[PDB]
Symmetry: D2
Subunit: 121 residues, 4 copies
Amino acid sequence: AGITGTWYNQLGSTFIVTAGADGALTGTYESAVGNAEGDYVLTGRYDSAPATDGSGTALGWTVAWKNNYRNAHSATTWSGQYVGGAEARINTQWLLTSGTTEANAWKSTLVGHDTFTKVKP
Amino acid sequence: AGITGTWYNQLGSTFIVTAGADGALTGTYESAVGNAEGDYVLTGRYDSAPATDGSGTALGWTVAWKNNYRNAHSATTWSGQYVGGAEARINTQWLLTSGTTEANAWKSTLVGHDTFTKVKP
Amino acid sequence: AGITGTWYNQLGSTFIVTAGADGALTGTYESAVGNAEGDYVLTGRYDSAPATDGSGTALGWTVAWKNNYRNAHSATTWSGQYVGGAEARINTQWLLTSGTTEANAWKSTLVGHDTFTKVKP
Amino acid sequence: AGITGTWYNQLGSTFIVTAGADGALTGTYESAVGNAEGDYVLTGRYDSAPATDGSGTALGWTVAWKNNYRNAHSATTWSGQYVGGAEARINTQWLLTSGTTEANAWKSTLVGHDTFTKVKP
Ligand SMILES: O=C(O)CCCC[C@@H]1SC[C@@H]2NC(=O)N[C@@H]21
Ligand SMILES: O=C(O)CCCC[C@@H]1SC[C@@H]2NC(=O)N[C@@H]21
Ligand SMILES: O=C(O)CCCC[C@@H]1SC[C@@H]2NC(=O)N[C@@H]21
Ligand SMILES: O=C(O)CCCC[C@@H]1SC[C@@H]2NC(=O)N[C@@H]21
């Protein structure tokens, strides 16, 4: 129940997600940067029975950057963990792969990290 | 239509996916390695209108490593592109995040790469 | 001249480096976490003629985790950029590879990110 | 003694390195792709007393992409392990950071993987 809701990262992007009882993540993502405009569909999975020892809750999700406004021919996955409590966070690393020619595949994938909080930066 | 079906990676893992008309990926993943046994639910997204210039089709998906057999308290995301043709491939990089304590969060995430083909290694 | 000196990251680790006129980085690294004790040799490279348009200065370095105290059978590389000015930073992502058996090579490499500043956290 | 010498990756790039007795890597790197021409200085570190149980030898190195021909305002680090024997390899993952403006720092770093062998692809 800690994951469902709206999350904001350090770039100004916004992430609205519903966490289903058995592990589904669904929602929408709006990026403040890049070749992106409006909301994009997201889907992912999370550990619906995490450890109870103070460990975070593992999760991940994907956005393909095609919507009613634009198609960037790219997709990002975020992998990370939810940490609950008063200053809850989802700490992630991400991989953004663009469709490329075979000759350019070596430079197809960017890597970065986003930290999400329940309140805006 | 090139993405739907069964895929095999260099580790001996197996990936069965359906690519929906508007960008959804759904299916199951069976890992040959790690703290894993049986099939796990996967969900993701792909670019349903890729470029037609020889560029690959961007995609990503997530597995949370909880199923009827085991719970590893972890999740992997694969980010990559589908390359069609006679020797079709899905070339990926992945991030595997384990739920950790805050003190151990610096070592929460493994990175690697998997190449998937339509035939077994 | 902005890079030479002592840097501190969010984990409490300390990085003393000399940037040579033609691109060399040399120094020592002390990690506050992990299988590490004391100072370890570091070496790397940086762009000694960066752009002057407000872009950062690309750089990277490596530590192998063997010194007079311990040998962790591992090595980390940090890749990033130096950003000068009043609140100077070195923003990095890193890869930590452990020596593994072939069967375990898929889980040989951790990924993360460190931000270094001139003052302690 | 297994690391010293010339190595070739899947892209057609060439890596000549000397491994010093106490952990230093020095040499030159020539990339077959990207904003690169000629040889570039490399420096890094390796575990000079690896485990003897069949585990690989952890290592890493950096190239800043500035030489007598070009300056790409970028640097790559490779992190990986050397695996000896008849078909020796250095298996790596790499991070390529470009100097960027602060607004573009989110897209500063590419990630990939290179496999090096003693003979050309
Ligand atoms: O430019 C593109 O190809 C599509 C937009 C990508 C935006 C990226 S996803 C990772 C990072 N986190 C964000 O919130 N935005 C950027
Ligand atoms: O050990 C775990 O935490 C769960 C199993 C992880 C298996 C990983 S996912 C990335 C890589 N590719 C595979 O097919 N298996 C491993
Ligand atoms: O545990 C090991 O194998 C050796 C110590 C690794 C410490 C890592 S390097 C990346 C991160 N940044 C730090 O300052 N410490 C950790
Ligand atoms: O384009 C640049 O910024 C400089 C050249 C980068 C070449 C990269 S380094 C990682 C990969 N492995 C290679 O051998 N070449 C590419």
